[PDB]
A paper describes a structure:
NrS-1 polymerase is a multidomain enzyme and is one key component of the phage replisome. The N-terminal Prim/Pol and HBD domains are responsible for DNA polymerization and de novo primer synthesis activities of NrS-1 polymerase. Here, we report two crystal structures, showing that NrS-1 CTR adopts one unique hexameric ring-shaped conformation. Although the central helicase domain of NrS-1 CTR shares structural similarity with the superfamily III helicases, the folds of the Head and Tail domains are completely novel.
Totally, two NrS-1 CTR structures were determined, one in A-form and another in B-form. The A-form crystals were grown in P212121 space group; per asymmetric unit contains six copies of NrS-1 CTR monomer, which were assembled into a ring-shaped architecture. NrS-1 CTR assembles into ring-shaped hexamer in both structures. The helicase domain forms hexameric ring in both A- and B-form NrS-1 CTR structures. NrS-1 CTR forms hexamer in both A- and B-form structures, however, as confirmed by the size-exclusion chromatographic analysis, NrS-1 N618 exists as a monomer.
Residue numbers in the entry:
A (entry chain E): 303 to 498, 506 to 635
B (entry chain C): 305 to 500, 505 to 718
Write the structure that this text describes.
């Protein structure tokens, strides 16, 4: 019967909708105004009807494989397989470089790292890399210490820049859930420790090339991993840290914000209104690529290790080292 | 001819139908009741109303969204949204400045007549009522039954109706579904136990998370903007682990039983509920201090909860760090002298040591044995106090002539 196998595709492109069928998910994808959805066929037929006034028996659209490759274009063809991209940049990801960081944002960051340039600057170099290059770092940041130090604020701040590319306030409960969409198409993944240690699985997520993604009413699917992990905790160690550890930077912050000079009421909100400013700043960093995956033995990381590690190990090591002083 | 004929014909009859691309479910709206139905179910409705079952459902594709502040419909970016928030009767009601008197007596009784906290709660409640957003603060009402905690719930439940969830329990949380958060401005939880995990700890994020995942039965797991605000009623048992430096929880112990007051008649219980409209009207007429909404206070009860929840080893370490002898004496260190573990001379040295923040091993052990009730080794004290809470370093200092192993605070 048919003259053209993609007529419908094209007509919907005419109207700024891009439809495809995902072979991988056996689910029809649809893309408008930088929002990607996956829908069953009937649901698409319902959309198509509304837009052309005709329900065709045959959905005349291309078969692609949807893939969250941030660096790669809108579409490409590895091997002989045509792919289509599920990454679409948020507004504040497409924004013009600058060299100055908004001042009230800077005060947050300073407050948070207790004014330590070394580690703070290292975190900006991490954050910049994630923002800019949009890859997996292979390092994660733990911010522990008392509440109101702006750990949660840094999360909201970043959550505005990254929008849909970041998961916020993921808890142990979310992990015990059989589904895990909080890793599907995510550049940043924030976790709250609230217990007064099931997160040890993240250790591997930080460095694993790929993740399995169980989503409700979708096929279990394996995907390239772009996750980068921040963990807010409140004096409770969230993860068993090995002595010789290369994944975790740990940053104790007990500088409550409401106890600073600079803190007004409108500060909380002011900070968030400067999200664009802080995006701009991040976009203009010149990224040292070797420092991204650098970790440091902060005071807190050491305390955590010397309490986590077995006293019998410590005895044995003192016997080995012939270390009377210990 | 027309892709939306059916939409319009059903609007003619006061039904608004759409297809919800996000839920892949057809939505339907009559008389401020929103339902989501599968296609066949819609076809069955449509048949009843026009006498024809069309193959094609000629309706617009919207995204249903629970945005209370926003209109019946809008178009962020290029996407047409439709609203699932419909105000209850008592949400659309004329402002007043006086609160019904019998309602006021409840509220007074409940906060033990403390204007500060009570007024703060009204400012919270007002903001929720009026501005219809997430506060980022939650209220715990604990203390004995019949203090009108449950009555306050019913009272509010009346004002908010469908936008409130009531008496959600640990069981409801263990359920894989969680519709008690779908399209809710207030979410009440009941704690019922003799606890002394505390699975309501998961709530702490909910208070402040921009969005929630909503697993409903026969619906897609869906992520939605969070409008939740949380009240928790409790028996005496603490329902959530409260950090010392906490910014989410206001706690209000109430042990004023209502049946022990002068003003309590039989018809009081019911009278209170009949004044729901009155209390709505009052709430609508508040002038909301926006800065006080997310304010929390260290009530007497919150402090008691913290000082019992926090680890005794932390509290020792902090007294070592703060060079705070008074604490140690408050916790019965002076008993070292009574039992002749130490003499008058050494006791001076020991107190001196805590204050100066320079502590000989044999005094550290003496202190920690005395506070805690059995002897702990230096090793243990290091691994379980000095080290995890970064009290200081183990070192040598020459006291008198002899070189002494000591812990140097800092
Ligand atoms: Mg893997």
């Amino acid at each position: 019967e048919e003259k053209d196998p993609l007529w419908l595709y094209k007509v919907l492109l005419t109207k700024g909708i891009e439809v495809w069928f995902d072979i991988k998910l056996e689910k029809y994808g649809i893309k408008r105004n930088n929002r990607v959805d996956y829908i069953a066929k009937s649901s698409l037929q319902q959309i198509v009807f509304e837009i052309i006034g005709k329900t065709p028996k045959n959905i005349a659209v291309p078969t692609y494989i949807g893939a969250y490759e941030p660096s790669k274009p809108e579409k490409w063809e590895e091997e002989g397989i045509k792919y289509i991209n599920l990454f679409k940049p948020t507004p504040l990801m497409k924004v013009k470089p600058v060299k100055e960081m908004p001042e009230i944002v800077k005060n947050l960051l300073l407050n948070l790292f207790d004014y330590d340039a070394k580690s703070m600057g290292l975190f900006i170099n991490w954050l910049a890399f994630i923002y800019q290059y949009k890859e997996r770092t292979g390092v994660a940041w733990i911010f522990m210490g008392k509440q109101g130090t702006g750990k949660g604020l840094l999360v909201d701040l970043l959550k505005k820049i990254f929008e849909e590319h970041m998961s916020s306030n993921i808890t142990d409960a979310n992990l015990d859930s059989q589904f895990n969409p909080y890793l599907y198409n995510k550049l940043i993944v924030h976790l709250n420790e609230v217990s007064a240690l099931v997160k040890n699985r993240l250790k591997t997520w930080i460095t694993d090339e790929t993740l399995y993604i169980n989503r409700k009413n979708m096929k279990e699917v394996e995907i390239k991993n772009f996750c980068n992990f921040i963990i807010n905790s409140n004096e409770t160690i969230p993860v068993d840290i090995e002595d010789s550890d290369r994944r975790f930077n740990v940053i104790e912050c007990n500088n409550v914000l409401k106890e600073q000079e600079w803190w007004t009421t409108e500060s909380y909100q002011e900070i968030l209104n400067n999200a664009e400013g802080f995006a701009k700043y991040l976009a203009g960093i010149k990224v040292d690529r070797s420092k991204v995956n650098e970790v440091v033995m902060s005071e807190k990381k050491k305390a955590i290790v010397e309490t986590t590690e077995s006293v019998l190990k410590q005895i044995a090591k003192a016997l080995t080292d012939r270390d009377i002083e210990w | 001819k027309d892709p939306l004929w059916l939409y319009k014909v059903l609007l003619t009859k006061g039904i608004e139908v759409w297809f919800d691309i996000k839920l892949e479910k057809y939505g339907i709206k009559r008389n401020n009741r929103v339902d989501y139905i599968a296609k066949s179910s819609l076809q069955q409705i449509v048949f009843e109303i026009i006498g024809k079952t069309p193959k094609n459902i000629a309706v617009p594709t919207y995204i249903g969204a629970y945005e209370p502040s926003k209109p019946e419909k809008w178009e962020e970016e290029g996407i047409k949204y439709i609203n699932l928030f419909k105000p209850t009767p008592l949400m659309k009601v004329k402002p007043v400045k006086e609160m019904p008197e019998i309602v006021k007596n409840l509220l007074l009784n409940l906060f033990d007549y403390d204007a500060k906290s009570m007024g703060l709660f009204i400012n919270w409640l007002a903001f929720i009522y009026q501005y219809k957003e997430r506060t980022g603060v939650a209220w715990i009402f604990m203390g004995k039954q019949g203090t009108g905690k449950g009555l306050l719930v019913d009272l509010l439940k009346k004002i908010f109706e469908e936008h409130m969830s009531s008496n959600i329990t640990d069981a409801n949380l263990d359920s894989q579904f969680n519709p008690y958060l779908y399209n809710k401005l207030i979410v009440h939880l009941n704690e019922v136990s003799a606890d002394n995990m505390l699975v309501k700890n998961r709530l702490k994020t909910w208070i402040t998370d921009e969005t929630l995942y909503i697993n409903r039965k026969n619906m897609k797991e869906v992520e939605i903007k969070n409008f939740c605000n949380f009240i928790i009623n409790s028996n005496e048992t603490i329902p959530v682990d409260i950090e010392d430096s906490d910014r989410r929880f206001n706690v209000i112990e109430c042990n004023n039983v209502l049946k022990e007051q002068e003003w309590w008649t039989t018809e009081s219980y019911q009278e209170i509920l009949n004044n729901a409209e009155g209390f709505a009207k009052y709430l609508a007429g508040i002038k909301v201090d926006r800065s006080k909404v997310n304010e929390v206070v260290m009530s007497e009860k919150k402090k008691a909860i913290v000082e019992t929840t926090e680890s005794v080893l932390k509290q020792i370490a902090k007294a070592l760090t703060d060079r705070d002898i008074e604490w140690f004496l408050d916790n019965g260190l002076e008993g070292v002298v009574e039992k002749n573990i130490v003499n008058d001379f050494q006791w001076e040295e020991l107190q001196e040591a805590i204050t100066t923040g320079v502590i000989p091993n044999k005094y550290l052990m003496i202190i920690v044995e005395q506070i805690l009730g059995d002897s702990k080794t230096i090793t243990w004290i290091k691994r379980n106090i000095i080290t995890p809470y970064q009290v200081g370093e183990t070192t040598v200092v020459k006291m008198a002539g002899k070189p002494i192993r000591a812990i140097v605070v800092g």
